[PDB]
């Protein structure tokens, strides 16, 4: 099976289905940033 390792910079969308709305949008460069 293919491996997907989210271990470097990525974009993230959180979507609501019924309205097709983007609730949140981001890019994670440093997940431990204070």
């Amino acid at each position: 099976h293919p491996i997907i390792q989210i271990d470097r910079s990525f974009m993230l969308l959180i979507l609501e289905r019924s309205t097709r709305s983007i609730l949140f949008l981001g890019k994670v460069v440093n997940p431990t940033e204070a």
Binding site: I4, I6, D7, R17, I22, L25, V29, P31, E33
Partner: protein, 339 residues
């Protein structure tokens, strides 16, 4: 169906604003609620007239010939209503509050409209005690985001006479939660070419919708929540983040929705939290909202005397992803002073 055309314009606004942020703060974490930002600005537009009003909705991405002003208003009202409709297993609430100065002369129509049509709570607020006002508003936002958005407003102008806030809170469980017994305590995450940080790395092997975009050179993974929501992870190939950012659009999302196929993936996802803040005053100005800030601002639909103008705007948003699911919240602040 009827909501889709709007949510699509809202999505392109999200990506355009995202790209402005990547210019403002390059190679840094970005995180925001586009629906929060859009919803707050549409609320303000409800009391605006003429070019003040048209600049706001055009800046949000609408074409008034394609979608008349009244249709935009009705649409956003329907959107907020639909998002707040109770869905089992999903916590999602989006709401607004208007903090109106003691001496403001708000139109009874504006107040009844926002209360009845736009999930708005109205509070009479004494801005003469600016410190206490700021605390009241911050505490309200904190409460409505289940404690997750703290200190939204850092400074409040002493001559403030109205504040409009929008808040969103989201908490959902993964359709397929991670087993914390399979989470690696300390795993490497590349933050730049020569530098890693350590994060807990969750791990499962499940069937997920995914694809490799052959044009954009990125992997796209969909992780469902247990009802009515999903997360999309976009992992560009080495060196391709900028080109992927340039390509993000509603068109790209529509393409991926067709191409996503469900199959087995050996999946590693970090457990983490982040937070981000944005001073949006100047950004919204650059994007086309001009008259709202001016001495000739037209908010004749809001107060008797057209007595206010926009002065400042800010957004804060927070995210946590862990084995059980995701919790995220955001809030938008719009400040008004005498015109």
């Amino acid at each position: 169906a009827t909501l889709y055309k709007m949510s699509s314009i809202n999505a392109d606004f999200a990506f355009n604003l995202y790209r402005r942020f990547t210019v403002e703060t390059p190679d840094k974490n970005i995180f925001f609620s586009p629906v929060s930002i859009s919803a707050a600005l549409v609320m303000l537009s409800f009391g605006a007239c003429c070019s003040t009003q048209t600049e706001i909705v055009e800046t949000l991405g609408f074409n008034l010939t394609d979608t008349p002003m009244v249709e935009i208003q009705h649409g956003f009202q329907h959107l907020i209503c639909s998002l707040n409709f109770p869905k089992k297993e999903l916590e999602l609430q989006i709401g607004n509050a208007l903090f109106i100065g003691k001496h403001l002369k708000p139109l009874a129509k504006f107040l009844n409209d926002v209360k009845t049509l736009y999930e708005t709570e109205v509070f009479s607020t004494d801005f003469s005690n600016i410190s206490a006002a700021k605390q009241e508003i911050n505490s309200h936002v904190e409460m409505q985001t289940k404690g997750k958005v703290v200190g939204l407003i850092q400074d409040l102008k002493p001559n403030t006479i109205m504040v409009l806030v929008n808040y969103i809170h989201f908490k959902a469980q993964w359709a397929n939660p991670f087993d914390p017994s399979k989470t690696e305590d300390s795993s490497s995450f590349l933050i730049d070419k020569t530098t890693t940080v350590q994060v807990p790395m969750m791990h499962q092997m499940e069937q997920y919708y995914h694809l490799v975009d052959m044009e954009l050179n990125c992997t796209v993974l969909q992780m469902d929540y247990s009802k009515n929501a999903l997360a999309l992870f976009v992992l560009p190939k080495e060196g391709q983040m900028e080109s992927v950012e340039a390509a993000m659009s509603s068109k790209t999302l529509k393409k991926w929705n067709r191409l996503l196929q469900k199959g087995w993936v050996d999946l590693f996802v970090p457990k983490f939290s982040i937070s981000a803040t944005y001073d949006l005053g100047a950004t919204l100005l650059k994007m086309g909202i001009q008259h709202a800030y001016s001495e000739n601002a037209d908010f004749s639909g809001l107060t008797e005397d057209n007595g206010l103008k926009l002065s400042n705007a800010a957004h804060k948003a927070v995210l946590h992803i862990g084995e059980k699911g995701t919790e995220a919240a955001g809030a938008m602040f719009l400040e008004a002073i005498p015109r």
